[model samples]
Target: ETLGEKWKSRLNALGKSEFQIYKKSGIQEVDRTLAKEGIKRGETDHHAVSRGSAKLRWFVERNLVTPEGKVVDLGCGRGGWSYYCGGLKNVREVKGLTKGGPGHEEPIPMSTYGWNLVRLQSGVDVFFIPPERCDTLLCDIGESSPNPTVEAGRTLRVLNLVENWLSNNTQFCVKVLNPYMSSVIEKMEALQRKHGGALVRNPLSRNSTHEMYWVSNASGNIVSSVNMISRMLINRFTMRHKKATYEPDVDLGSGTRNI
Candidate 1:
């Protein structure tokens, strides 16, 4: 198989990937009801709830989203969130960053998600965009690493990238593992405490998973703090008088043919 390889399966598959299989415990309502004093297991109504747009809509309901807002979706798969946000009269542009390999589904089509007011980028890698351009960021990565320690490191790297790309004032939402298992929340806990808004929950998330959302505003201090020194360096490294053309004298400083 190679890039853009297209083929139909008798259908795609996973151990839990068989779409016909249903895990009662994976449904949030079922888990909640079973936890309640009145109910027993498997005694709740069955309805469909998807994790992506539901979470985004939660942000909108609370006025977290602004008109002309530019969004970045990290690990955007199938681009459910990108499509939803791009269509909003409020959101302006949406950057969907996704991995290049095959996974839960086959390679996605551009027509399906790319018509997104256009914020599509694939092969999540060394990010190319200039910083401070994005006002909102969201992430929900699929399963990859299994080892607990390995997963911790992986998530931390994603968080590091998240911190670097955020604007001076911005909003971010990430699907993260629980407190004890990963070293993610300690710093974020401090962040959310100071910048906390109405605490929202994705009713779609299963009760069994050690996952939560860090949706809040306030990632500027990292940028703000460095700017004090940054201003100095930027001021010193002035290039206003510099010309764009190849100055044989200035650039070459006496260019000579080498043996």
Candidate 2:
């Protein structure tokens, strides 16, 4: 099946709250016919435009795309971010990393925009020689694992991103999955302080439940980051944590309480 078909059904299966919807008054006096080639090149390719470049544009609006700076789209799904930054003036380098295999690699760039976007294979040179500052590496980590899920996939990917290459202090445009299992914030904070010393915030609405971004001045954020770490440690001891309710209840609780 095409990515379009898969996502179309997936979104429809979820409740209305899970994805965006279009409400109509049911009175459009246009052609109500169904036919082949009815639409011209209409593909669900949501990741490229609606979710890809659009989100990156939001970051650009807030001055995240630094002038004369290098940019990377780690999981350059359709290469929208790469193409955008590649053409932007004063942008030195635009690197796009996409997954590749014996029969896979779907980059949506029309001739690299005069050699602006340099495409790289994820498992090849990417693992061997990581990029300096990746832009949207976090955007491509959805459903990347099994069981506890992202830890094996998303979290591990993030840990790899932070531990291996990004430790050199790069102002990040985090498009990471916000699943309850990840701690991307802590790692981001270390750089936030080192880079300047402060963190900022951003809000969300259109993207999936597991993706968001934030901006920071990096000059007055050390205290906030430290407090967050302190709060985390304190919560570790005082706040009791629990997994799913399916775990066996203790005898003091008198067998499974959900009986």
Candidate 3:
């Protein structure tokens, strides 16, 4: 089956929450129920944008397309933003970058093939490779690095990648710890002052532990918008730790830095 069909099947079968409703009646009925519940619909509802599709749909419906009419999702983990962006016909391409393979210490299976968003196991570490750019870039760098400083290093690497690969008119939608978000923004701005970007604060509604979303566009239209709406979302989350920092003696050099 195609990627779209595969995700539709999973949403029908392995997707327990909706599958329960499907078991009671036909798939059609379940789909209607999901519509009422504001669950994302169609191919976009695939595990990637399962939760955030509605909002993304709203953004598109409102004609939030950039002048160039192309967008890129920076940390397209499990293809969430990519699914949403791809759903929009205007987007040229939704390229994602990650250092996922089998040989790593904590290999991320889903990231291995680039679309296994259904894997729910924790302790899986995925690496960040800078993306070749376009109009807009979304960075969902949740736990790509061990700590703030380490994450900073990875962000620097990503920035360098974007600077080298992307076109001159790329936008960034990234997530950063609220407390330290400004510091990161300042650093990025300082590095790429010629291409100015704005930081908008859109905190995740799930829980206190969740971080904020910062949308950095090159157009100087830095609007701080927040989505206070409550909705269920699927997150193909990854986790990593600095073994040397936590456990120094365990192959400090061979530690899992780029998982």
Candidate 4:
């Protein structure tokens, strides 16, 4: 079945029509209409299963991950990515690390490493993850706050932690907001460069509100670069223009240097 049809089937299994589901969701009218439009356009999913599968396929096609490789999903919400990776053929293991409850309340058959008070930073050892062992890291800590400094700080910390924990030449994929100021993207680009990595932005949302970056680390055993397939995918989905910009009072220092 096609992705759009599969989504419709799942919604049907919920025992509610599209309109009923929207009404019960309690979302504001404007947002609800926007979501309805997205569904109509086949650009949105009721669950992340299909979308995660697409992302996993993207990784597999690029050789960013192999069946024998170990995959780590950082901030794994609802365990969608973790579950998908774990079920892949030849995958040695899939470990999901989360700082809160599962993204959804429904129980899923996936193993996850959970920590209640995790703070990512340089020089800090993440107790559960072995050093230099992760083959691929998936982080989707998108901007959740309005403050630019706080948003940039969290993104930087996560990047630092991933750089320290994952083996060299591994793959790192992170989702971040494309803020208006350009400072956050600039800082992220610089940090990736410092780690001997290159960054390519992929649009995860229309209008550039959200983006995903693929970074290949420089130190690992296998030397790799962003392949043509990835470039094609990015070109196919990237937004043509910015949707919005954010300006904050505090200066969040560039890269690793603070203001």
- Candidate scoring better on TM-score of 1 and 2: 1
Error of 4 at 117 (Å): 26
Error of 4 at 110 (Å): 6.1
Query: Which residue runs of candidate 3 sit more than 4 Å off their true CA positions?
Result: 1-49, 52-70, 99-133, 144-148, 177-185, 205-210, 217-259
How would you order the candidates by TM-score, starting with the best?
Answer: 1, 2, 4, 3
lDDT string, candidate 2, 1-259, tens digits: 3222233234345456323321111111211122112212443212232234444555566665342356666666555566555555556666667665556455653333323334533444344454565432323434422233343256545535644544344545544343233244555555455544233323222212323343332344433533443333223222233211121111110111110
Q: What lDDT tens digits, residue by residue, belong to model 4 across residues 9-60? A: 3333443343243222321111234433443465323323224434444555
| lDDT per residue (tens digit) for residues 41-95 in model 3 | 3332223323343333333343442312455554444444555554443455455
Clashing pairs in 4: 67-90, 67-91, 78-103, 168-220, 169-220, 180-245
Ranking by lDDT: 1, 4, 2, 3
Task: Count the clashes in each prediction.
Answer: 0, 7, 3, 6
- lDDT of model 3, residue 248: 10
Q: Which pairs clash in the backbone of model 3? A: 72-136, 74-138, 139-173
User: Residue 105 lDDT in model 2?
Assistant: 53
Pick the TM-score winner: 1
Error of 1 at 259 (Å): 59
Clashing pairs in 1: none
TM-score of model 1 vs. true structure:
0.54
